[PDB]
């Protein structure tokens, strides 16, 4: 014999060390071994924290926000059980995404009156789209149905940003910035001031106050406070003049051409322009901090990496630049595209870039070493992509691709085969959404990986 229940007999920390050397499958089986083993495993937070981190379902910095969200969802479970349930759900979903023989359920819904969709937000069980038909459409991603259409813009909608609690902000060719309440189904505020098309926008929170920042073809950016919710009007509250607008903060002048892209966090906001430069702003002081010069052509996309205090810029000059926002200095120039680089995304571990030649590049989010490289086979310009540490989904004319970033392999190339264009793609967990064009019409596609 000489057999011994080592897991029970050993001190807790040591048996814990043993479970950390196991894959999740073995840990799951171990839960069914005996009451004591069951008790020992469900005792440690770290065990499930490590597994969640190791599968890129969460980062160390994101852990607290995950825990709170889990507490809200499962009020009557221990932290350990919350983390275990979260892990099992996430690993189940991921396996479906990775299984080339898995096929998601598909829901196809009417899009806009025009075939081109210009912007899409996917947050809080809402899918929200804008187009040149002057309309904003809101969808329920849980029941996978159309909810309502938000009308009011006198021009096409070209920028959208979801805030919180069914509140959203839009920018249009009518030069207005509009605040909407989904649950009231109306526009609550119309902010005028821009002298040209509102091209882009972002929302930041600094000292528990949300601000709207809007870039325009008038070479400027306008800063506005996001209005608070009401308790117990003449909606929409129209503000024809900025100085007489209590939600108006000020104008940020600096660029000599259209403000194409904007990215902010806290009091720091970065703008990119067709004048080949970027500016780092302090919207608390309403002052220019740095001017990032060096690109030889239009800036199409920028990301403010606030975690590392850096700026990433993508240009028509085919280059990507990394800037140190502690001193305003150039850090790196990345050369991995031979065409306009107009799309950037940052996940916890990957900076991802996509170009007009159909190329997509993955760079390490910290040292920018080359992690992956993809190319749409028809060499059509990348119109949209979305990415996590585990999955890349990309779109272009006649192509919609899902890539496994671990194995580097294409999982699915034909899920949205009937689409002619992919205007916008976004995913979170079990849900993947795409605004597409097919035979001269726009549609919203919803893919379910549960």
């Amino acid at each position: 014999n000489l057999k011994r229940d080592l897991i029970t007999s050993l001190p807790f920390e040591i048996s814990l060390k043993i479970f950390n050397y196991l894959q999740f499958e073995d840990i799951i089986n171990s839960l069914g071994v005996s009451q004591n083993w069951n008790k020992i495993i469900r005792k440690s937070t770290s065990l499930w924290k490590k597994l969640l981190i190791s599968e890129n379902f969460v980062s160390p910095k994101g852990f607290n926000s995950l825990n709170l969200k889990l507490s809200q969802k499962y009020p009557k479970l221990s932290q350990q059980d919350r983390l275990r349930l979260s892990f099992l759900e996430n690993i189940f979903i991921l396996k479906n995404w990775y299984n080339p023989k898995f096929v998601p359920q598909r829901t196809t819904l009417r899009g806009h009156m025009t075939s081109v969709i210009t912007c899409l937000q996917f947050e809080d069980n809402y899918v929200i789209t804008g187009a040149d038909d002057k309309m904003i459409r809101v969808y329920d991603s849980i029941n996978k149905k159309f909810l309502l259409q938000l009308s009011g813009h006198d021009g096409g909608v070209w920028a959208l940003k979801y805030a919180h609690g069914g509140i959203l902000v839009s920018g249009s060719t009518d030069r207005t910035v509009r605040v909407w309440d989904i649950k009231k189904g109306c526009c609550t505020h119309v902010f005028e001031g821009h002298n040209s098309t509102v091209r882009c926008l972002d929302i930041v929170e600094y000292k528990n106050i949300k601000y709207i920042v809007t870039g325009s073809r008038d070479n400027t950016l306008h800063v506005w406070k996001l209005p608070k919710e009401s308790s117990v009007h003449d909606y929409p509250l129209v503000f024809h003049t900025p100085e007489e607008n209590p939600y108006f903060v000020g104008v940020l002048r600096g660029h000599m051409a259209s403000v194409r892209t904007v990215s902010g966090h806290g009091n720091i906001v970065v703008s990119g322009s067709y004048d080949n430069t970027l500016i780092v702003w302090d919207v608390a002081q309403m002052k220019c901090l740095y001017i990032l010069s060096g690109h030889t052509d239009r800036i199409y996309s920028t990301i403010y990496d606030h975690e590392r205090k850096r700026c990433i810029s993508a240009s028509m000059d085919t280059t990507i630049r990394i800037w140190d926002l502690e001193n305003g200095e150039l850090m790196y120039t990345l050369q991995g595209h031979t065409a306009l680089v107009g799309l950037l995304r940052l996940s916890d571990k990957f900076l991802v870039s996509a170009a007009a030649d159909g190329s997509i590049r993955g760079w390490d989010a910290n040292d920018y070493s080359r992690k992956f490289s993809y190319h749409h086979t028809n060499l059509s310009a990348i119109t949209t992509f979305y990415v996590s540490d585990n999955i890349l989904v990309s779109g272009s004319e006649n192509q919609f691709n899902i890539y496994n970033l671990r194995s580097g392999k294409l999982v699915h190339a034909n899920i949205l085969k009937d689409a002619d264009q992919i205007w916008s793609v976004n995913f979170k967990g079990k849900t993947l959404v795409a605004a597409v064009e097919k035979d001269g019409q726009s549609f919203l596609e919803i893919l379910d990986f549960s």
Partner: peptide, 10 residues
Amino acid sequence: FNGLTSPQRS
């Protein structure tokens, strides 16, 4: 086509 739709001039 560069993949990025743009509004038309005002």
